[PDB]
Amino acid sequence: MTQAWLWIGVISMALGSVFFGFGAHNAKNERWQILYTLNFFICLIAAGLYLAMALGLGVNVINGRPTYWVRFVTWFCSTPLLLLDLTFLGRTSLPLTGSLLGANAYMLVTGFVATVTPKPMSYIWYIVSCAAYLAIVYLLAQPYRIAAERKHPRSKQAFRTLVTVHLVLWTLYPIVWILSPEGFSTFTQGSETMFYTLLDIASKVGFGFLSLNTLHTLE
Amino acid sequence: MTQAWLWIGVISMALGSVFFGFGAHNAKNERWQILYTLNFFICLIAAGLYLAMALGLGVNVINGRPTYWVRFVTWFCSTPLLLLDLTFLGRTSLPLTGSLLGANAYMLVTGFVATVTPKPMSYIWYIVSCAAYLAIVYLLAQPYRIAAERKHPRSKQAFRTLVTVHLVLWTLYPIVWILSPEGFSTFTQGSETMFYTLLDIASKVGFGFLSLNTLHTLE
Amino acid sequence: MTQAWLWIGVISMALGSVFFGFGAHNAKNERWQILYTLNFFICLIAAGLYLAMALGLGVNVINGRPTYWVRFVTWFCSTPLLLLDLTFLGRTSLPLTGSLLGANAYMLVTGFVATVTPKPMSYIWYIVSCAAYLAIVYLLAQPYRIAAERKHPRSKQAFRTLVTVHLVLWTLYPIVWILSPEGFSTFTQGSETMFYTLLDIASKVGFGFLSLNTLHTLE
Ligand SMILES: *C/C=C(C)/C=C/C=C(C)/C=C/C1=C(C)CCCC1(C)C
Ligand SMILES: *C/C=C(C)/C=C/C=C(C)/C=C/C1=C(C)CCCC1(C)C
Ligand SMILES: *C/C=C(C)/C=C/C=C(C)/C=C/C1=C(C)CCCC1(C)C
Ligand SMILES: CCCCCCCC/C=C\CCCCCCCC(=O)O
Ligand SMILES: CCCCCCCC/C=C\CCCCCCCC(=O)O
Ligand SMILES: CCCCCCCC/C=C\CCCCCCCC(=O)O
Ligand SMILES: CCCCCCCC/C=C\CCCCCCCC(=O)O
Ligand SMILES: CCCCCCCC/C=C\CCCCCCCC(=O)O
Ligand SMILES: CCCCCCCC/C=C\CCCCCCCC(=O)O
Ligand SMILES: CCCCCCCC/C=C\CCCCCCCC(=O)O
Ligand SMILES: CCCCCCCC/C=C\CCCCCCCC(=O)O
Ligand SMILES: CCCCCCCC/C=C\CCCCCCCC(=O)O
Ligand SMILES: [Cl-]
Ligand SMILES: [Cl-]
Ligand SMILES: [Cl-]
Ligand SMILES: [Cl-]
Ligand SMILES: [Cl-]
Ligand SMILES: [Cl-]
């Protein structure tokens, strides 16, 4: 059921926050503190999202089906910080950071329009949103990776792992979307929630740990 | 269905035992043999639990719902050995081992009372059981980790990984419990079984492999 | 539902192909190119299988139930290449390769007979197919591992990980089979599809990445 996964999401994000929080406090140096604090806020942001959705907020019937528009409101806040874990670890220049944040903001807004518009029109917006996402794939796969590998020549494998896991996790969101009642409707509303919840826990708590392990590798 | 996951649990634990068994035999030295044998017994204990539950044993209708009280009977036997993988790898002193086993035994007995008592009374016992679990979180996170890191100074990352994975896996059990009909009832009896089965395979077969990889790291 | 997982399978294998394809192109040397190309074809083969099954092809009612015989047609093509990732990485001699491919081909054909025959007769074929699989377990666990470890003495852990993950993943297929309506019928046709799809994505996309990480370890 929808409620079950929304409550699993609340506790998992809340417990993720406690761990990153206890890590933020008791951090060795400033570099460790910033990384734990970024991840603490990401999980606090997702905890709030799931708490509102679990309590039945941020949902309205759009085009016949119940739609959690609040997901886009918070993804607009957490995804930029999730991209900052990468640029912070990589020590990426401000212009590339701006490009990434720019493309990320374009993808979510057009992605939001695809969710609230009736079909076939929504497919146009889904396509626009995917092109913005493919602009991010390129930025991380090419200029981000190159700059990060030239800055950390003994740790090329750490950035390949960061980027690849990021690519695998972020690609499943438009897939879930196109297979849900928003697209082809191959599965219900209940499966869509389970999928987004598993994806969110993985992209926030999971990537959270991966970014800390990456910093231990970099030393 | 309940039966499906109970039979997946039997085979997974049985197959886990065969692998640790074949490892116990053909072990290089005594240190490797003890680790494979600990894990062999853990999985043999879980195989028996799932075989009894799959055959419909160790279940009675308590407070209107069917309750697998046999889970606590075997968790009382396997969880102490799962804590011994940690103290064995870490080379932890007997007093700390006793403290861990003590808190672990207190958590399961009060945890068992929470399962057999009617609500609201059961919430008191759930809270007592959680405090005992938080005493274990502390012991592993602080004196266990410190002693293990001072004994293995080149392998601090191995113990951070052992402890963190242990913390993530063991925390999901009270979550599953509070969301099941024992607590808030956000999901059925069929989902509770699937969850405990996935958790058990992960905590026994999965942690089993993680503890062997940790020993290879320590050399 | 059956269709949902079949479409998740199509996209996941298609996306796996794009990644290995983009890797095949842009590969440093010949060794990297062969590995990415092997994995590119494996995923292209699975993409085709799922596309046919998703479009309702390669299925007929055998012994009362709908049976996807096309799974065995493609497993006959992809599993030999999945074994070649191992022999290619390990630098295994042609005779052992032939033995592995031989036992693999025997397992699938008898495995195919078990699927199309009525029960109890099908159990005989399931048993024959399992013995052929246990001949593969032995070959990878013993002569393959020994030869690969003597060729790569600083990378014994890489081959233990390749072999173990292969052993864990390939063992779940006969388990899924014996628990489905083909055997004991502990779960429906819809769960069987979900299970094979999760197993296939893991054994092809997942093992795909694991074999690339193994090559980075070997250098
Ligand atoms: C913590 C939340 C995360 C990491 C979610 C990120 C969401 C996306 C990458 C979604 C992208 C979408 C498309 C590429 C096209 C339209 C549909 C979207 C919005 C799901
Ligand atoms: C192999 C089995 C394992 C690792 C299970 C461990 C079980 C727990 C850590 C359960 C703890 C519980 C609470 C902290 C409060 C009450 C409910 C329990 C018993 C599920
Ligand atoms: C990419 C597809 C993969 C890796 C599938 C491999 C399938 C097997 C190892 C199945 C083996 C079977 C038995 C050992 C006995 C009869 C049933 C089978 C065919 C499922
Ligand atoms: C630097 C990038 C900042 C992101 C800004 C992106 C703006 C995208 C432009 C147009 C999207 C369409 C505006 C939304 C109208 C939706 C109407 C509706 O709610 O039905
Ligand atoms: C019964 C309805 C029929 C269902 C047909 C579903 C067809 C699925 C095919 C293609 C999915 C669209 C491709 C996904 C976009 C790739 C994500 C990205 O842009 O990175
Ligand atoms: C230190 C490196 C370790 C990182 C390796 C782990 C990589 C695993 C990545 C992705 C697989 C996880 C996918 C599970 C998320 C749920 C997806 C869904 O339900 O749609
Ligand atoms: C060293 C720690 C050993 C663990 C001993 C813990 C004992 C806990 C004390 C009291 C728990 C309550 C006793 C169980 C009564 C349950 C009655 C019932 O079954 O309904
Ligand atoms: C429809 C019924 C409403 C459901 C409300 C569910 C509320 C869930 C909120 C909190 C869960 C309890 C917190 C879990 C305990 C933390 C585990 C631990 O002690 O380590
Ligand atoms: C060598 C280090 C490798 C260890 C890293 C792996 C860490 C992954 C840990 C936890 C995620 C797995 C959670 C899946 C268990 C099922 C949970 C459930 O269904 O409730
Ligand atoms: C080198 C190994 C090559 C693999 C060849 C294996 C051949 C196995 C032998 C006999 C299997 C039975 C033949 C299939 C008859 C099925 C009849 C039917 O479809 O109902
Ligand atoms: C209601 C019907 C009863 C269901 C009983 C199911 C019994 C399950 C017992 C054993 C499963 C068969 C063993 C699996 C084969 C091992 C795989 C291998 O050969 O490697
Ligand atoms: C670089 C080494 C990393 C490899 C370690 C990961 C090992 C995990 C292996 C197996 C667990 C995954 C099982 C999930 C597949 C789905 C199974 C099913 O649904 O039947
Ligand atoms: Cl969020
Ligand atoms: Cl470096
Ligand atoms: Cl147990
Ligand atoms: Cl050390
Ligand atoms: Cl295939
Ligand atoms: Cl080597």
Query: What is the DSSP secondary-structure string of A68-92?
Result: -THHHHHHHHHHHHHHHHHHHHHT-
How many Cβ atoms from other residues are within 10 Å of residue B206's Cβ? Answer: 17
Which run of H or of E encompasses A181? none
Give me the half-sphere count of Cα atoms (radius 13 Å) on the Cβ side of residue C183. 20
Residue tagged 């399961």 (tokens): B108
Residue C157 and residue B11: Cβ atoms within 8 Å?
Answer: no
Dihedrals φ, ψ of A88, to 5°?
-65, -50
Residue C15 and residue A171: Cβ atoms within 8 Å?
Answer: yes
Which burial class, exposed, middle or buried, applies to B120 when counting CB atoms under 10 A from its CB (0-12, 13-18, 19+)? exposed
- Strands B65-67, B60-62: pairing is antiparallel
- Exposed e or buried b per residue across A130-149, where buried means at least 16 C-beta atoms within 10 angstroms of its C-beta: bebbebbbebbeebbbebbb
Whether the CB-CB separation of C148 and C92 falls below 8 Å is answered with yes
Which atom of ligand 5 is found nearest the CA of A137?
20
How many Cβ atoms from other residues are within 10 Å of residue B144's Cβ? Answer: 26
Residue A67 to residue A58: CA distance in whole angstroms: 8
User: How wide is the angle at C-alpha B46 spanned by C-alphas B42 and B52, nearest 5°?
Assistant: 150
The number of angstroms, rounded, from the C-alpha of A106 to the middle of its chain's C-alpha atoms is 14
Say which DSSP state A61 is in: E
B187 contacts on A by Cβ (under 8 Å): 1, 4
A128 CA to middle of ligand 1, Å? 12
The interaxial angle of helices B94-116 and B156-179, nearest 10 deg, is: 10
The interaxial angle of helices A121-139 and A156-179, nearest 10 deg, is: 180
Residue C28 to residue B96: CA distance in whole angstroms: 52
Residue A190 to residue A113: CA distance in whole angstroms: 22
Chain A / chain B CB contacts < 8 angstroms:
21
Compute, in degrees rounded to 10, the torsion defined by CA atoms C181, C183, C187, C190.
-40
Dihedrals φ, ψ of B139, to 5°?
-60, -40
How far, CA to CA in Å, does B45 sit from each of B48, B98, B147?
5, 21, 30
The number of angstroms, rounded, from the C-alpha of B46 to the middle of its chain's C-alpha atoms is 10
SS3 assignment, position B36: helix
C191 contacts on B by Cβ (under 8 Å): 4
User: How wide is the angle at C-alpha C66 spanned by C-alphas C62 and C68, nearest 5°?
Assistant: 95
What residues form DSSP beta bridges with C67?
C60
How far, CA to CA in Å, does B201 sit from each of B67, B81, B204, C93, C199?
20, 15, 5, 36, 16
Query: What is the DSSP secondary-structure string of B197-213?
Result: HHHHHIIIIIHHHHHHH
The residue range of the domain holding C73 is 1-219
What's the CATH number where A194 sits?
Answer: 1.20.1070.10
- Nearest-Cα distance to chain C for A211, in Å, is 18
Residue C8 and residue A175: Cβ atoms within 8 Å?
Answer: yes
CA-closest residue to ligand 8 atom 12? B178
CA-closest residue to ligand 8 atom 20? B171
- Residue partners of A133: CB distance under 8 A and separation at least 6: A103, A107, A170, A174
Which run of H or of E encompasses A125? helix A121-139
Q: Domain total for chain A?
A: 1
Structure obtained using: X-ray
Whether the CB-CB separation of C52 and C70 falls below 8 Å is answered with yes
Structure tokens at C132: 């052929």
Residue B191 and residue A15: Cβ atoms within 8 Å?
Answer: no
B106 CA to middle of ligand 7, Å? 8
Residue C191 and residue B4: Cβ atoms within 8 Å?
Answer: yes
- Residue partners of C133: CB distance under 8 A and separation at least 6: C103, C107, C170, C174
Which burial class, exposed, middle or buried, applies to A200 when counting CB atoms under 10 A from its CB (0-12, 13-18, 19+)? buried
User: How wide is the angle at C-alpha B170 spanned by C-alphas B166 and B176, nearest 5°?
Assistant: 150
How many Cβ atoms from other residues are within 10 Å of residue C100's Cβ? Answer: 22
Nearest CA in chain C to B4: C186
CA dihedral sign of residues C162, C168, C172, C174: positive
Residue C31 to residue B163: CA distance in whole angstroms: 38
Query: What is the DSSP secondary-structure string of chain C?
Result: -HHHHHHHHHHHHHHHHHHHHHHHTT-SSHHHHHHHHHHHHHHHHHHHHHHHHHTT-S-EEETTEEE-THHHHHHHHHHHHHHHHHHHHHT--HHHHHHHHHHHHHHHHHHHHHHHSPTTHHHHHHHHHHHHHHHHHHHIIIIIHHHHHHH-TT-HHHHHHHHHHHHHHHHHHHHHHHHSTTTT-SS-HHHHHHHHHHHHHIIIIIHHHHHHHHHHHH-
Residue in C164, C171, C179 closest to B7 by CB: C179
Structure tokens at A118: 């009736």
Which burial class, exposed, middle or buried, applies to C202 when counting CB atoms under 10 A from its CB (0-12, 13-18, 19+)? middle
User: How wide is the angle at C-alpha C103 spanned by C-alphas C100 and C108, nearest 5°?
Assistant: 120
Which burial class, exposed, middle or buried, applies to B39 when counting CB atoms under 10 A from its CB (0-12, 13-18, 19+)? buried
Interface test with C, best of B5, B11, B193 (most C CBs within 10 A): B11
User: How wide is the angle at C-alpha C104 spanned by C-alphas C45 and C174, nearest 5°?
Assistant: 85
Query: What is the DSSP secondary-structure string of B113-134?
Result: HHHHSPTTHHHHHHHHHHHHHH
CA dihedral sign of residues A38, A42, A47, A48: positive
| Encoded amino acid at B4, one letter | A
Alpha-carbon Rg of chain C, whole angstroms? 18
Give me the half-sphere count of Cα atoms (radius 13 Å) on the Cβ side of residue B142. 9
Residue A186 and residue C15: Cβ atoms within 8 Å?
Answer: no
How far, CA to CA in Å, does A36 sit from each of A89, A211, B93?
12, 9, 31
Residue C128 to residue C130: CA distance in whole angstroms: 5
Nearest CA in chain A to B172: A12
SS3 assignment, position B1: coil
Residue A217 to residue A214: CA distance in whole angstroms: 5
How many Cβ atoms from other residues are within 10 Å of residue A169's Cβ? Answer: 18
A209 contacts on B by Cβ (under 8 Å): 164
Residue of B125, B172, B175, B176 to mutate, ligand 8, most atoms within 8 A of C-beta: B175
CA-closest residue to ligand 11 atom 12? C178
| Residues within a 6 A CB radius of ligand 3 | C 75, 78-79, 82, 107, 111, 114, 126, 129-130, 133, 170, 173-174, 177, 200, 203-204
CA-closest residue to ligand 9 atom 8? B165
Peptide bond into A120 cis (omega under 30): yes
Structure tokens at C65: 């139930």
Strands (E), chain B: 60-62, 65-67
Long-range contact set of residues B158-165: C-beta below 8 Å, sequence gap at least 24:
B158/B214, B158/B217, B158/B218, B159/B89, B159/B90, B159/B214, B160/A216, B161/B210, B161/B214, B162/B86, B162/B89, B162/B90, B162/B210, B162/B211, B162/B214, B163/B86, B164/A209, B165/B207, B165/B210
Whether B102 lines ligand 7, by a CB cut-off of 6 Å, is: yes
- Strands A60-62, A65-67: pairing is antiparallel
Whether the CB-CB separation of A151 and A217 falls below 8 Å is answered with no
